[PDB]
Structure 1
Amino acid sequence: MTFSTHKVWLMFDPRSTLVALAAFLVVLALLIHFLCLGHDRFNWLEGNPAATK
């Protein structure tokens, strides 16, 4: 999908596609944030010093 592919919505239902995309994006963002929290350097709440080695 690009800017010029407007005809993709004659194949994909815009409402269901939007809902599925929102769910996927939220889940991915949560996963990435949790991965950052799962490591010492990038857990901004834990606040370890940047040099973890």
Structure 2
Amino acid sequence: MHRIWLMYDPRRVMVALVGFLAVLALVIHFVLLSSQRYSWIENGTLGADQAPVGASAPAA
């Protein structure tokens, strides 16, 4: 499978890879930080049972 590095230049791809991973990681952390459930800077010391949960269906 290393023949793929005869098609694509490692110089171009490794920059594009690091860029994509850095952007994806940062997007996920800020999505979680904005949530109630995972606002870990304020609430990280709460136990799992104490952490927020979104509203269930009432079904009635």
Alignment of structure 1 residues 30-49 onto 2, 5 Å: 30-47=26-43, 49=50
Structure 2, unmatched stretches of 5+, are 55-60
Q: Which has the larger radius of gyration?
A: 2
Normalised TM-score (structure 1): 0.80
Q: Secondary structure at the match of 2:25?
A: helix
Aligned to 2:17: 21
Count of residues paired in the alignment = 49
Residue 28 of structure 1 aligns to a residue in which SS? helix
Unaligned runs of 5+ in 1: none
CA RMSD of superposed structures (Å): 1.6
Percent identical across equivalent pairs?
Answer: 49
**1:50 maps to which residue?**
51
Higher RCO (C-alpha under 8 Å, 6+ residues apart):
2
